[PDB]
Structure formats: C-alpha cells, structure tokens
Design a protein around this ligand. Structure first.
Ligand code: NAG
Lengths: 49, 50
C-alpha cells in the first residue's frame, strides 16, 4: 500500500488532468458551434421565412 | 427605430419596442402587427382593357 499509493497518485493526477483538458476543449468548441447555430437560425428566419 | 428583419424583434410585423430593466439584464417589449381574419378571393396577374 504505502508505495503503491504514491505511484497511483501520480497516475490519478495525470489521468484527471487529461480529462480536464478534454472538457475545456469541448467547452470552447461548443461555443463556436453555438455561434454557428445562432447564425443558422438567423438565416432561417431572414432568408427562408 | 423599426426593423424589417423577420423574427428579429418578435413575431408578426414589427411596429415598435420598449425596453425595461431587470437584474443583470434587459427585457424588451416588442409590439407587432399580426394579420387576423382573412377571406378567399379569386385573383389574376393582369386586367385586359382595350
Ligand atoms: C379557403 O379555401 C380553402 C380550400 O378550399 C379552405 O380549406 C379554407 O377553409 C378557406 N378559408 C378561409 C378564407 O378561411
């Protein structure tokens, strides 16, 4: 246990950082998509309707 | 002003708007004109006279 715990904390921290990085990138990309969707909605109203 | 953009300032034909304040934001009251009762008429592209 004592030694394993040290090695495991190194892996947990790293694994957790990878997940946080993933989420941050998804939030940024989601914002870009939302802007596109808002534009598409505007076009639907002003070009189609 | 008066907008001509479809659905930009509410549904129907926009006439005018009035802002109201709110915590952390703005609320708009949009006044529009909406066609109501309607009738079915015959039509034609042109009238021939002489
Ligand atoms: C206009 O004509 C259509 C097709 O016959 C009919 O379904 C509709 O009820 C009529 N109505 C109006 C002007 O309300």
């Amino acid at each position: 246990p004592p030694e394993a715990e040290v090695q495991i904390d190194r892996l947990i921290t790293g694994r957790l950082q990878s997940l946080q990085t993933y989420v941050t990138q998804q939030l940024i990309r989601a914002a870009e998509i939302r802007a596109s969707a808002n534009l598409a909605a505007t076009k639907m109203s002003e070009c189609v309707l | 002003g008066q907008s001509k953009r479809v659905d930009f300032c509410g549904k129907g034909y926009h006439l005018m708007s009035f802002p109201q304040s709110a915590p952390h934001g703005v609320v708009f009251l949009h006044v529009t004109y909406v066609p109501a009762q309607e009738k079915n008429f015959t039509t034609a592209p042109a009238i021939c006279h002489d």
